[PDB]
Amino acid sequence: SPGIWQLDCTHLEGKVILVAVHVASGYIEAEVIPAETGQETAYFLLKLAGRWPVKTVHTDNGSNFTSTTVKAACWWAGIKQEFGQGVIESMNKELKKIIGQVRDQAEHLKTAVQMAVFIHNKKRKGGYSAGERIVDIIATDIQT
Amino acid sequence: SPGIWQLDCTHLEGKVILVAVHVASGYIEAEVIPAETGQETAYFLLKLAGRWPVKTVHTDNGSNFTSTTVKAACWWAGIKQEFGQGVIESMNKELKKIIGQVRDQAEHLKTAVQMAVFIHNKKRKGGYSAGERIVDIIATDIQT
Numbered sequence: 001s002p003g004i005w006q007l008d009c010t011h012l013e014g015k016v017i018l019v020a021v022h023v024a025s026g027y028i029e030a031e032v033i034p035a036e037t038g039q040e041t042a043y044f045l046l047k048l049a050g051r052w053p054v055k056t057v058h059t060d061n062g063s064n065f066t067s068t069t070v071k072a073a074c075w076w077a078g079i080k081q082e083f084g085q086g087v088i089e090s091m092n093k094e095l096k097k098i099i100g101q102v103r104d105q106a107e108h109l110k111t112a113v114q115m116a117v118f119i120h121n122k123k124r125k126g127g128y129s130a131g132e133r134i135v136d137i138i139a140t141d142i143q144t
Numbered sequence: 145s146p147g148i149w150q151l152d153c154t155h156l157e158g159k160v161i162l163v164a165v166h167v168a169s170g171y172i173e174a175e176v177i178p179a180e181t182g183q184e185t186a187y188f189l190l191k192l193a194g195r196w197p198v199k200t201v202h203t204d205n206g207s208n209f210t211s212t213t214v215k216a217a218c219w220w221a222g223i224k225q226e227f228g229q230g231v232i233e234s235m236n237k238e239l240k241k242i243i244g245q246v247r248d249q250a251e252h253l254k255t256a257v258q259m260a261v262f263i264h265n266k267k268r269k270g271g272y273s274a275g276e277r278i279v280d281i282i283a284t285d286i287q288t
């Protein structure tokens with residue numbers, strides 16, 4: 001399903017990383033956030049939904065989506081909580097792997113995360129990349 | 145050309161907004177940044193390039209791209225400075241228009257910007273939306 005995303009946080013070096021995975025393609029978007037708050041998650045969601053067609057968001061920590069600030073962002077953006085796992089487990093551990101491998105290519109973690117996001121979305125797997133699959137899946141879906 | 149982006153900053157309420165426009169489609173990505181520094185622009189660029197195929201970046205303030213931190217991000221990500229304007233002028237003023245119209249739908253400017261980014265990328269113009277045009281242009285280009 002073209003509009004389903006998975007969202008979780010992961011910790012590294014005393015910092016929080018928010019990771020969103022487009023489930024049908026394995027494409028990721030991540031950000032280093034100051035703290036694991038409702039505000040940060042709501043904000044991230046509103047950004048994601050202006051960039052990709054976000055219909056439903058799945059998470060492995062259900063309580064992350066209970067703040068007033070997260071429901072308000074999902075209400076405004078039209079998002080529902082997905083109620084329907086191999087790809088996501090692979091994508092997150094893979095992310096930390098690439099983070100580990102590019103960590104010395106940058107001073108701060110936040111740069112290293114974006115370098116790993118880039119590496120991950122471009123790597124062909126076969127065999128297209130996740131970034132090629134997500135636009136392929138979205139382009140086909142637009143046209144009926 | 146599918147990989148050309150335009151980047152500028154704009155000021156509103158004492159704050160800086162970074163606005164990137166995919167030139168062939170009119171699709172936008174924006175962020176409210178703390179300050180107009182080289183670090184912030186480099187970071188934004190590295191994020192953009194892990195999300196969309198960024199080949200060349202055009203700007204209306206050439207000196208924005210002279211810091212060591214911006215050239216390092218463009219060097220790493222493979223980006224060059226575009227050396228080759230109606231769409232972008234329309235897209236930026238339009239952004240402030242929509243920012244003006246949704247400003248009371250949120251407490252902070254940064255939420256309002258993302259609500260305007262969303263509104264802008266989804267609005268059909270005809271007649272597809274910018275978000276539909278950018279994946280159409282990228283999907284076609286992938287396949288030869």
Ligand SMILES: [Cl-]
Nearest residue numbers: 106107108111
């Ligand atoms: Cl750095």
Ligand SMILES: [Cl-]
Nearest residue numbers: 250251252255
């Ligand atoms: Cl707000």
